[PDB]
Amino acid sequence: DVTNATLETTGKELTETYMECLNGDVVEVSIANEERIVSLLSSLASANVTLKQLIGTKIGVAVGQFLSDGFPPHIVRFSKGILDYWFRQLPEEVQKQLLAKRA
Numbered sequence: 888d889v890t891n892a893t894l895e896t897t898g899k900e901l902t903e904t905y906m907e908c909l910n911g912d913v914v915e916v917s918i919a920n921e922e923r924i925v926s927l928l929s930s931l932a933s934a935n936v937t938l939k940q941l942i943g944t945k946i947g948v949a950v951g952q953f954l955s956d957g958f959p960p961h962i963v964r965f966s967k968g969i970l971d972y973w974f975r976q977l978p979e980e981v982q983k984q985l986l987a988k989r990a
Contacts, residue, residue, distance in 0.1 A: 889934040891944055898949040901927050905952045914957025924953065924962055932969050941973060947985075954989050963988060 908916045941947050953966040967986050974982045
């Protein structure tokens with residue numbers, strides 16, 4: 888049972904770290920940021936986030952940020968896996984468009 892506060896705190900730090908790896912068009916992920924992204928995502932991968940938390944905290948959008956090609960493949964997969972679990976109660980057609988690797 889994850890809290891709204893923890894989900895919100897994790898969300899901003901993920902978005903802040905995303906902004907640091909965006910140089911405009913180039914994605915540049917340092918070793919330290921790479922480990923921070925995996926650490927933040929890992930902290931959410933076991934969280935049974937409810938649907939009300941998904942919309943309220945926007946944690947799905949924060950994790951969705953890292954579905955972009957510029958980011959490392961294993962991190963893109965990790966983010967897709969976490970969102971796939973959180974969206975597990977939606978039809979496959981809906982999930983496919985939520986999990987689409989973006990640009």
